[PDB]
């Protein structure tokens, strides 16, 4: 038993709710919250601007730290960092930007991350500003994460649209 509340339960281990991350993140307080990073953790826009916004600007100091001393992450990759306020850890993952002409493919990669935490909460990889089909990125996601993932999608329009057309 855990303390998500109000998702709908997808598949055995996936579930999914309307909600912003940010707020789902500051109650349940989890163990790992998922960043939609970029390679050189810049958090801008989309989920890392409003999760990186809400620790007032703490999650931008500490990465600016990791970059300067281990180099940009790949597409496809990850690190963990403290949660902050938001949760005991973050776990920055870097799904392919669509917009910036990255491989598709990598998606799955970039979920592969999720199966080493037991329990997750997290958005879908790649969608929003990083341009991929939201309805693919659940796929992949269905179809490549083994662990709990607890899936907030902000927008109530999209959420409807990935339920009802889910296979
Ligand atoms: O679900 C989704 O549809 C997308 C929504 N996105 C976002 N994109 C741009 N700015 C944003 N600010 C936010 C503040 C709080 C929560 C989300 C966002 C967000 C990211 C997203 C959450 C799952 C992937």
Do not use: W
């Not at 601007?49 to 597409?75: C, F, H, R, W």
């Not at 970039?110 to 969608?127: C, D, I, T």
Request: with cysteine.
């Amino acid at each position: 038993v855990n303390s998500f509340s109000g998702y709908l339960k997808l598949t055995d281990n996936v579930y999914i709710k309307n909600a912003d991350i940010v707020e789902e993140a500051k109650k349940v307080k989890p163990t790992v919250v998922v960043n939609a990073a970029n390679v050189y953790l810049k958090h801008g826009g989309g989920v890392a601007g409003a999760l990186n916004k809400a620790t007032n600007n703490a999650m931008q100091v500490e990465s600016d730290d990791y970059i300067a001393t281990n180099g940009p992450l790949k597409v496809g990759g990850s690190c963990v960092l403290s949660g902050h306020n938001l949760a005991k850890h973050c776990l920055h993952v870097v799904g392919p930007n669509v917009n910036k002409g990255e491989d598709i493919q990598l998606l799955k990669s970039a979920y592969e991350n999720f199966n080493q935490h037991e329990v997750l909460l997290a958005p879908l990889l790649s969608a929003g500003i990083f341009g991929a089909d939201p309805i693919h990125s659940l796929r992949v996601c269905v179809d490549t994460v083994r662990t709990n993932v607890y899936l907030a999608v902000f927008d109530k329009n999209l959420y409807d649209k990935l339920v009802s057309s889910f296979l």
